Every structure is written in structure tokens, then in C-alpha cells.
Design a protein around this ligand. Structure first.
Ligand SMILES: [Ca+2]
Ligand SMILES: [Ca+2]
Ligand SMILES: [Ca+2]
Ligand SMILES: [Ca+2]
Ligand SMILES: [Ca+2]
Ligand SMILES: [Cl-]
Ligand SMILES: [Cl-]
Ligand SMILES: [Cl-]
Ligand SMILES: [Cl-]
Lengths: 451, 460
């Protein structure tokens, strides 16, 4: 088997483990001239010198010399196309017609006083930026082992720590995380007498904390429309199958959520940067397009195989819907649909920033056995290959590798993911991250220098 | 107390600080014969003599500014009445122009510590867990949490377990600081020179079970280690400031500087950091360098940080003079870059950010086994890697946070104790903490915040 993503492609990827040896033939009639490993590209037709190399329906490079059919195309046989300037990129030149809406889909969630719906019932603890740091982590640890077990309806407790002139990103991120629907309607804020005492201070905090736990323990889930979901998507260990299996499937589920009237988010500026010329045309208008370019140059400025090919594989998670809004690190959306939330690719930082943007569910695609997870929101981990789903059967919540062998289609895995999202949001199924407690501490993005 | 007091740091000073809570009202007289003309709050400066216009303002024996207008004696000097002196260029600062004569050595001082195979001595018996930079991250934090609740309780002689995480994506141009820092932390003596390295299908739960068996083998071996009498020369003490206070440089800092000189005399290694806190006073550290190469190396770290950073305003030069007071009077024998380890013994300058958790993490990487943390605020700062001795600047603070302040230096402001007395009291407190005879409040309540490696490179 070989996988051809788009119809106009002139190259394909080998899926067979160990690759395919010379002599192997395919239905169309071509034949390999040499051995080609799995994940590497093969020429479908004879491509001439300086000839375009097409994959994902776009130019990923040019041939350095004439490449014969059925030959292995290595990174040394291609010339990368230099990315064009940002002021020359087309904006809103091809906004697709909205697909027919999906109505009636629901999930059991926790309705908040502000109208938002949480997928989890958590206790949030924070402190004013002018108070001392270290009290929140100490109190959260005591609440987890001494009180949390007495309130089973409470999914957990999360500490929101501030960092110790231009550092607006970290402050905005911590304040917006406390507005996430999984915290409900009230996060806890902790901050004359000759002898006060530290132990005394903590005793008072634990009394306030037990009052909140008793109230959260009495909350119940109610049937809510799928339009109240906010789903975030990010990549973990980039793989040769990421853009041909998991990513396209996530993009199909992304389009289904947009049709339900929900909010989907894709981030990672470093992962989509070399393909921004394919996102700008999908902006609903120019102000949203220029706002998209503004985030690209901000990150290029902050930073002081085929990168274009990998970027095309990442944007596959965005699906085909229109980009209705662009967010800066830690901002919250004001519109519903496909949103672009600028964030670093670094897994724990991306997750923390998406949680700040208000996601209630996160989908994490990966080609490596990573124990990534968050307590703030349930993390659905999708494998890119079947070999990976079998090796880490207790980490991979869903397998997209069935697309590479033709056993399942992008549409089938996409719908399977959509239904998995509603079941996780309803608490009917627990992701492996929530089953084993794979929760890594929040990592706020701090682009400002440390004093 | 109806006894009015002011604290004059150096003999040549023409200004002092009011110590009485609520300050001193006009009419109050002092032994020398001075008298206040107006009310002056605590922490604020008072003129000891009539200072003329453009006249020098001296504190800590150095010029902190010039008077905007003629200042009469016994008057309150606010930050709007002084003009900061333009700082001179770094290439024009004198190097090794005044290296003090080495003081007579202190012999016989010891502490009960854990001798390592490399010759170092630890003050704590910890389990270090790390992973190769090419492996996936998140496994160490998960395993450490399971070891703390399921195995650690079975091995009481083990003080605790610490996870050492690398950077998300790496192999370099500027990302040498975080790699060097994580590698040097595993060489810290409190890990005993034996950190754990972790990195039909098996599955994730199965992988962890194997790691817990390797972890239980290490805990059983560490649980059998015992402390041995070691010379105080094997100590490595780090010093940093927390909540800057008006008394920091007149009480706790000078006392820490006296204990710093005692440790140097014992043949131990002392460290002071925080580039942002000492930057506006570098012209007083450069002359104490043992030689020019160490002096230019000191200026090199100042400009590296300046480059990296590219009545509501206190005097920055005045605050900096108060911070360098922790360095004492010994000679600076070596300068380190963020996360480097020393090759010489004595007073060392380890460049690090002032940010409390990052400074601590970087000093632990440099090899400190004990840290002294001065502060004027009730902070719950602490580290698991090394015991943290928290020193209060005011007696009012030591009483308000009696379960956080390990030692009180506020007795200097009221004249009940001297810099020398509090300095020796700190030195003996350090030996007792290093021996495990006394437990700091940070280790008693478990005020341990996760390590925060300094990452000056942008995150992708
Ligand atoms: Ca990522
Ligand atoms: Ca099928
Ligand atoms: Ca500090
Ligand atoms: Ca006395
Ligand atoms: Ca205790
Ligand atoms: Cl020299
Ligand atoms: Cl040096
Ligand atoms: Cl080094
Ligand atoms: Cl004594």
C-alpha cells in the first residue's frame, strides 16, 4: 500500500512496515526501481528537472535533477520553495460555502451561571499578582489528599500560579484560565495581630476550600447542546503519517463541530508558519486575515525534513471550514466556529494556552508513546499508526492508523472521533490521561525576559 | 518601647534610617545631639548634617546621589530630593584594585554529612530522577509522584525524591544554559552521585512498574546511608534576597556577609547571585576580584544580562549597595555563568536572575548544599534539593511569621544584638541545618516548589 493525499499529487508515501523492496508493482502499473522505507516518498510518474513536487495538492519543492518513476525521493533531491513575504499573501480569496448544519447533538455537562458548559467539575485556586507565590501549590496538595477524597463528584483541584511592563501574556493567560467553564462560577482567591502564623493562615484557607468542595459536590450534569463545546487540537510527536491519517481525521471532526455551532481551535505557530499561505485564503474577511499575519510576524520576531511538507500535514487538522477569528496567546474568543489561537508548539505550553482560551476538551494526535495530559480538560490521544495503538494500548484512546491500511476512511475515523468527544465531554468514557492521572502542571507562556 | 533609634551603616555616612515602628515625631532627640524637624516614617532616610545643594548623599560609605536643594539636618529625605549619579561605563571600572588580606582561618568546625564517591558532602539524602533529552517528557513527573506516595514512606532515611526535566524540543545556539543546568543539578552532592536515568506488547503501566522496581532498588541503598563528621570546608552555601526591605542592607544582609566571611575562613565555598540586584553596584565588586581575568569575567556577565533584557521609584544604587552587603568583605575568587560549577573555593559570584525560584534552581545547579534567604515579607519560599534558612529583617516580621522565619536579624536595628553576634548565630545555624540537627521551616512543612530552570532562549 501507498497513500496519495490529494488527486493532483505526483508523489505517495509507503505504509508497509520495513518498506517495499524493488520489483513491487501497484494496480496503476508503476514499479519501484529500489527499496523505499516506510514514511518516505515515491515518484508516481517521471518528473523532469526543476519540475514541481506536489503533495497535499500544493508545491512542496522542485526536483534538483530528473527523477524517474518508482524512485525514492530523499530530502537531498528536492529544493525547498522560499516562503513568500506576509504582505503579499492573499486574504479571504477562497472562503468555502458553509456545510449544512448538524442539529440535535448533545452531551451531559455542568451548566454555569454565565451560560457556559463545563465537561469537568473542578476547584480552581489562584492569588492576586501582588501576593507571595508558593501558597497555592502547598494548599492544593493538602486539599488533594485530605479533602478531595470526601467529595467524589469533584473531578479535581487545580492551582493557578502567577509568574514572579510588557508581560501582559502571562497575566491575561492566568485570568482567562479562571474563566474556563470547567471551574464553574467561582475560583478561589487566597492572599494588627502580633502573631499571625503560616499554619493558621492555611487552616482558614482549608475551611474556605471545604465550603467550595461541598457546593461543587452537589452539582449534576444536564443535557446541553454540542454547540456549547470548545475543542482544542494540537500535535505531539510529528510523524510521517500525521498528515495522512490522524490530522485529516481531526480536520473532519473539526468541520462536524463547526456545523454543530461549537468552537474549534488549532494553534502551534511554529508548526503552521511554512503553510500560512493556505490559511490566509480561508479567513472570512481581510481584518481576520491581517490579524492572522500579525501573529505570524510577532512569532518570527520573538525567535530573534521538508518544513513546507510537514506544515501542510499540520494544517490538515483545521479541516476546510472558514477561520472566523484569530487569538493572541491567552485570549478568549468572541465568535463561534473555527478559531486560530496562536501558541508555541511545546505540548504543555500549548495545552495551558488553549485551556486559557476556554477549551473544555482537547484532541492530541501523536506518533510517539507520550504520557501527555491535563487535569483542566480531558485529553483524547489519537495514534497515527496501528503499530503505535497496539504498543501503547493504555495511552492511545483512538487509532487513526486504520486509514493507512485502507481498513477505515477519513470520514469514518472523523465521525468515530466526534462521537468519542461527546462521550468524553458527557463523562460516559474516561480518556487514559484521566484514568491514570497523567496530569502535568500548567505551563504559562512567558515571552518576556526573566529579571 | 519609647527609645528612639536610627541606623547608620558606614562611619562616613551623612544619612541614617529610622527603625521605630510608626516612625519618630518632630522634637525627638538622639545621643549624638541631633533632633528631627518633622515626622519621619520607619525605613526612610534622615539627614545627620546640613547638606548643601548638589551636595553628596553618602550611605554604605558610597555616593548614592546628590541633593536637588539644600537639605537641613534632621529632615526627611524622600526619593524626590535626590538625583541618581550617572553610572560609569563597564570598561572603565577598576579591577582587583583592593583585594583584602586573607583573614586567619577557622579550624575544627564540622557538620554531619553524607560523603559521596566524588569527594563532595551532601546535607540531604535525595533520589534524583532524570531522562535523556531525546526521550519524551512527562514520564519523570508521573513516576516521581507515584514514588512519593507508594515507596518513599517505606524508606524514612531518604529525605525525598526530585524530578529533573529537560526541554521539550532539543538535540543549541542559545539553549546551552538549560542543558548545562540540568546536567550539573544531577552532580549536586544531595543526590549522592547516583541519579536514576529512565527512558505481544508491553504498554505504559508495565513500563512504569519496571521503573518503580529500579526506583525501589535505589531507595533501599540510599536508606542505608549514614552521616559522617566532615570539615565545614565541604559546605557550599548560596545566598539570595526575597522581598527587598528598607532594613535588608542594615540587618540581615550585613549579618549574612559576616557568616559568608566565616565560611570562607573555614575553607568552604559561598555564593551570591542576582545580576539585577547587584548591577547598579558592580563598581564595588570589581575592585574585590583576586585578578583582572576574574574582574573582566565579572563585567562579561553584567553586559550579558543587560543585553538579555533587550515618589514611586526608590534609589536603585542605594538598594544595590544593600544587596552586595551579603558578599561580606572576602575576595571574589571566581565568576560563574548561569548553571556552571566552581573550580575554586572561597567567595564565588554565580550570575543568575533575581526571580527567587529560578535563582534557587541555578544555585542548586552550581552545587550549593545550603541556601540562606533574607526577606522582609512572609514568603513560603523553599526547595527540596537543599535546606533553605529564611532570615527576617525586622523583629515584627519574625513574630508575625514565627513558623516561617528560621532566624531573626531585626535585633540589630534595636541594638539588642550586633552584626557579628547575628553572623555567628547564623554560622552555627548553618552547621546545625547541614548536620540535620535542626530542620528549617521550609523542610518542616514541605514548602517545596518545583525546580525552575532558567531558559533565556525563545520557546518554539
Ligand atoms: Ca504540541
Ligand atoms: Ca472498514
Ligand atoms: Ca531572589
Ligand atoms: Ca544584647
Ligand atoms: Ca513535618
Ligand atoms: Cl589575571
Ligand atoms: Cl572566574
Ligand atoms: Cl559547568
Ligand atoms: Cl560563638
Amino acid at each position: 500500500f501507498y497513500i496519495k493525499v490529494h488527486d493532483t499529487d505526483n508523489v505517495a508515501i509507503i505504509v508497509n512496515d520495513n518498506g517495499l523492496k524493488a520489483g513491487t508493482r501497484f494496480p496503476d502499473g508503476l514499479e519501484l526501481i529500489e527499496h523505499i522505507p516506510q514514511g518516505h516518498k515515491v515518484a508516481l510518474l517521471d518528473i523532469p528537472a526543476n519540475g514541481e513536487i506536489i503533495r497535499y495538492g500544493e508545491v512542496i519543492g522542485y526536483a534538483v535533477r530528473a527523477i524517474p518513476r518508482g524512485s525514492w525521493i530523499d530530502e537531498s533531491m528536492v529544493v525547498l520553495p522560499e516562503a513568500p513575504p506576509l504582505h503579499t499573501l492573499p486574504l479571504a480569496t477562497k472562503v468555502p460555502e458553509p456545510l449544512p448544519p448538524l442539529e440535535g447533538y448533545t452531551f451531559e455537562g455542568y451548566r454555569n451561571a454565565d451560560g457556559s458548559v463545563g465537561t469537568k467539575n473542578l476547584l480552581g485556586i489562584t492569588t492576586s499578582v501582588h501576593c507571595v507565590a508558593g501558597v497555592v501549590d502547598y494548599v492544593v496538595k493538602i486539599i488533594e489528599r485530605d479533602l478531595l477524597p470526601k467529595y467524589p463528584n469533584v473531578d479535581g483541584v487545580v492551582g493557578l500560579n502567577h509568574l514572579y511592563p510588557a508581560a501582559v501574556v502571562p497575566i491575561r493567560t492566568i485570568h482567562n484560565i479562571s474563566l474556563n467553564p470547567n471551574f464553574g462560577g467561582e475560583v478561589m482567591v487566597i492572599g494588627d495581630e502580633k502573631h499571625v502564623g503560616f499554619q493558621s493562615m492555611v487552616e482558614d484557607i482549608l475551611q474556605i476550600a471545604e465550603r467550595h468542595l461541598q457546593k461543587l459536590n452537589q452539582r449534576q450534569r444536564e443535557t446541553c447542546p454540542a454547540s456549547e463545546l470548545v475543542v482544542g487540537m494540537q500535535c505531539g510527536g510529528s510523524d510521517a503519517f500525521s498528515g495522512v491519517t490522524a490530522n485529516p481525521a481531526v480536520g473532519y471532526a473539526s468541520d462536524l463541530l463547526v456545523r454543530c455551532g461549537a468552537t474549534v481551535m488549532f494553534s502551534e505557530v511554529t508548526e503552521v508558519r511554512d503553510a500560512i499561505h493556505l490559511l490566509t485564503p480561508r479567513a472570512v474577511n481581510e481584518e481576520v486575515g491581517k490579524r492572522l499575519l500579525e501573529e505570524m510576524e510577532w512569532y518570527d520576531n520573538y525567535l530573534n525534513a521538508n518544513v513546507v511538507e510537514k506544515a501542510l500535514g499540520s494544517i490538515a487538522k483545521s479541516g476546510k471550514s472558514a477561520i472566523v477569528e484569530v487569538l493572541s496567546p491567552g485570549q478568549r474568543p468572541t465568535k463561534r466556529g473555527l478559531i486560530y489561537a496562536a501558541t508555541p508548539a511545546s505540548d504543555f505550553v500549548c495545552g495551558t494556552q488553549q485551556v486559557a482560551s476556554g477549551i473544555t476538551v482537547q484532541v492530541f494526535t501523536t506518533g510517539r508513546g507520550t504520557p501527555y495530559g491535563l487535569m483542566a480538560v480531558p485529553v483524547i490521544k489519537m495514534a497515527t499508526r496501528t503499530e503505535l495503538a497496539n504498543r501503547w494500548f493504555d495511552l492511545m484512546d483512538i487509532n487513526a492508523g486504520t486509514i493507512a491500511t485502507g481498513e477505515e476512511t477519513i470520514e469514518e475515523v472523523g465521525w468515530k472521533l466526534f462521537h468519542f468527544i461527546l462521550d468524553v465531554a458527557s463523562g460516559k468514557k474516561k480518556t487514559f490521561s484521566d484514568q491514570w492521572g497523567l496530569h502535568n502542571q500548567l505551563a504559562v507562556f512567558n515571552p518576556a525576559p526573566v529579571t
